[PDB]
Amino acid sequence: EEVRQFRRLFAQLAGDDMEVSATELMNILNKVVTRHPDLKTDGFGIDTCRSMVAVMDSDTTGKLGFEEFKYLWNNIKKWQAIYKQFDVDRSGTIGSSELPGAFEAAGFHLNEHLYSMIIRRYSDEGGNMDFDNFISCLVRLDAMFRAFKSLDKDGTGQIQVNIQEWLQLTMYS
Amino acid sequence: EEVRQFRRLFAQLAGDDMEVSATELMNILNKVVTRHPDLKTDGFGIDTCRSMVAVMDSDTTGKLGFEEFKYLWNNIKKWQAIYKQFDVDRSGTIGSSELPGAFEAAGFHLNEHLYSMIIRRYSDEGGNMDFDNFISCLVRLDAMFRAFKSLDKDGTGQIQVNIQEWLQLTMYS
Ligand SMILES: [Ca+2]
Ligand SMILES: [Ca+2]
Ligand SMILES: [Ca+2]
Ligand SMILES: [Ca+2]
Ligand SMILES: [Ca+2]
Ligand SMILES: [Ca+2]
Ligand SMILES: [Ca+2]
Ligand SMILES: [Ca+2]
């Protein structure tokens, strides 16, 4: 079973402290892309990985527990399929014209202004986004959507955030 | 006279397009740390540099203009001296105990809870923070305080934000 299969994966990846650190995450993500010649990437760097862990570390242990890793891992597998699916010219990267359809397929309906800002921060000079950049951006987008949703208690579409909360959300990510 | 030297620096750095890109920033930053012995870094990576440019890119051109680069360059020169001043055990890195004093010298007064989060995200090893992690952290902290202050006209210590604004603030960084 996939549940039995996942505990085994996590158990082996987590190791001695029973949690997945940024380094352990980096190593497994780099092993995976190595098996996919259709995914162009300069590799998952340690900083990108420290960022992914921080943003997914709900309980501030500094590392990823079973549930935190299960959530991240399931998303990455779903997003990896979308990436292959929307790279219609097989450039191994998500071009600017390919980006909106890929994000929308992922469940994020943004606007032209936001898509342009995403491209300015996450794509290269040619306007192309490689695999590690794509996954890194989606992990953060999903987390920022979840953070806003949880702060929007009244369902008014506006949130109030104090300086302490602001610093915690932006610095630990 | 010190501004005639800087104009020459920016021009030769900015090149054909008259703006410093994340790539251009990475090169200059890695040349500098080489001609600086006990500063310890694993080098300035492209993701870290893409992040520093995004946070400093006020006019959304995607790159650093003269004034945007000037502000950044001066802070780095100011923060590098603090890094050296506070690395009392001359380990070439900023440890847990050395951190609060260095940030206080930069003008930041944060609580211990915020410091523990910063150490998990930027040090997390033996609690030591190398040079690129230190500068990266401060560039972001400075930008996040400046961002918050812009929306909180006449200090209430709280900002009100909708989803578009929230995504612009948290994703374009
Ligand atoms: Ca572990
Ligand atoms: Ca955790
Ligand atoms: Ca493509
Ligand atoms: Ca990349
Ligand atoms: Ca340039
Ligand atoms: Ca600019
Ligand atoms: Ca030290
Ligand atoms: Ca580093």
Sequence-separated (6 or more) residues with CB below 8 Å from residue A91: A40, A128
Residue type, B114: L
Please measure the distance between the N-terminal and C-terminal CA atoms of chain A and give it in whole angstroms. Answer: 33
CA–CA gap between residue B140 and residue B51 (Å, rounded):
8
Using the Cβ of A159 and the Cβ atoms of chain B, whether some distance falls under 8 Å is answered with yes
Residues near B18 by beta carbon (within 8 Å), at least 6 away in sequence: B65
- Token pair 């890094």: residue: B83
Cα–Cα distance, B75 to B136 (Å, whole number): 11
From the candidates B21, B26, B64, B120, which should be mutated to test the interface with A, based on the most A CB atoms within 10 A? Answer: B120
For residue A56, give the CATH number of its domain: 1.10.238.10
Residues 6 or more apart whose Cβ sits within 8 Å of residue A132: A29, A33, A41, A42, A43, A44, A45, A48
Distance from C-alpha of A173 to C-alpha of A22, rounded to nearest angstrom: 12
State the DSSP string of A96-160. TTTHHHHHHHTT----HHHHHHHHHHHS-TTS-B-HHHHHHHHHHHHHHHHHHHHH-TTSSSEEE
Q: Mutate which of A167, A169, A172 to disrupt the B interface (most B C-beta within 10 Å)? A: A167
Number of domains into which chain A is organized:
1
* Helix (H), strand (E) at residue B159: strand B158-162
Interface membership of B136 toward A (CB under 8 Å) = yes
Collect all residues of chain A within an 8 Å Cβ-Cβ radius of residue B50.
121-122
Kindly state the helix (H) or strand (E) to which residue A162 belongs, with its residue range.
strand A158-162
Cβ atoms of B20 and B14 closer than 8 Å: yes
Single out the residue of B50, B49, B62, B64 nearest to residue B9, CA to CA.
B64
Cβ(A123)–Cβ(A133) under 8 Å?
Answer: yes
* A152 half-sphere exposure, CB direction, 13 A CA radius: 14
What is the rounded CA–CA span in Å between residue A106 and residue A66?
Answer: 23
Q: Any idea of the CA torsion for A84, B48, A75, A151, to the nearest 10 degrees? A: -140
Best mutation site among B47, B52, B103, B110 for testing chain A: the one with the most A CBs within 10 Å? B47
C-alpha B172 to ligand 5 mean position (Å): 20
Tokens standing for A41?
């990437």
Q: Which helix (H) or strand (E) holds B140?
A: helix B131-151
Q: What contacts 24+ positions apart, CB below 8 Å, involve B114-117?
A: B114/A164, B114/A167, B114/A168, B114/A171, B117/A60, B117/A168, B117/A171, B117/A172
Q: Residue A74 and residue B97: Cα distance in Å, rounded?
A: 38
Which tokens sit at A24?
């352990």
Residue A82, token pair as written in the block? 């979308």
Cβ distance A158 to B162 less than 8 Å, yes or no, reads: yes
> In chain B, after which residues does the backbone break, taking C–N over 2.5 angstroms as a break?
none
**B11 appears as a binding residue in the annotation:** no
Q: Which DSSP category does B64 fall into?
A: B
Looking at residue B139, its amino acid is: V
Those residues with Cβ within 8 angstroms of residue B38's Cβ, 6 or more apart along the chain or in another chain: B87, B90, B92
Cβ within 8 Å, pair A22-B160: no
Do the beta carbons of residue B138 and residue B110 sit within 8 Å?
no
Helix (H/G/I), strand (E/B), else coil: A91? coil
Rounded CA-CA distance B11/A143 in Å is: 39
Q: Is A39 left (phi over 0), alpha (psi -120 to 50) or beta?
A: beta
Count how many residues are written for chain B: 173
- B-chain CB neighbours of A60 within 8 Å are 117, 120
Report which DSSP code applies to B21. -
* Nearest alpha carbon to residue A107 among A128, A74, A148, A78: A78
Tokens (6 digits) for B11: 């021009």
Q: Which residues are bridge partners to B162 per DSSP?
A: A158
Q: Which residues contact A14 (CB under 8 A, 6 or more apart)?
A: A20, A24, A66, A69
Contact yes or no for B95/B127 (Cβ under 8 A): yes
Do residues B54 and B82 make contact, with C-beta atoms less than 8 angstroms apart? no
Cα-Cα-Cα-Cα dihedral sign, residues A53, A58, A62, A66: negative
CB contact at 8 A, A108 and A144: no
Tell me how far apart the alpha carbons of residues B99 and B44 are, in angstroms, rounded to a whole number.
20
From CA A151, how far away is CA B114, in angstroms rounded? 20
- B102 φ, ψ (degrees, to nearest 5): -70, -45
Distances (CA, A) of B85 to B32, B34, B78, B81, B141: 18, 19, 11, 6, 20
A24: which residues sit within 8 A by CB, 6+ positions away?
A13, A14, A15
Contacts of B124 in chain A (CB under 8 A): 21-22, 50, 62
SS (H, E, C) B89-119: CCCCCECCCCHHHHHHHHCCCCCHHHHHHHH
Show the domain range for A65.
Answer: 1-173
Residue A134: both structure tokens together: 């794509």
Asked if the Cβ–Cβ distance from A168 to B121 is below 8 Å, we say no
Token duo for residue B104 = 């206080």
Question: Tokens 């979308």 correspond to what residue?
Answer: A82
Q: CA-to-CA distance for B145 and A75, rounded, in angstroms?
A: 32
Q: Are A23 and A17 in contact (CB under 8 A)?
A: no
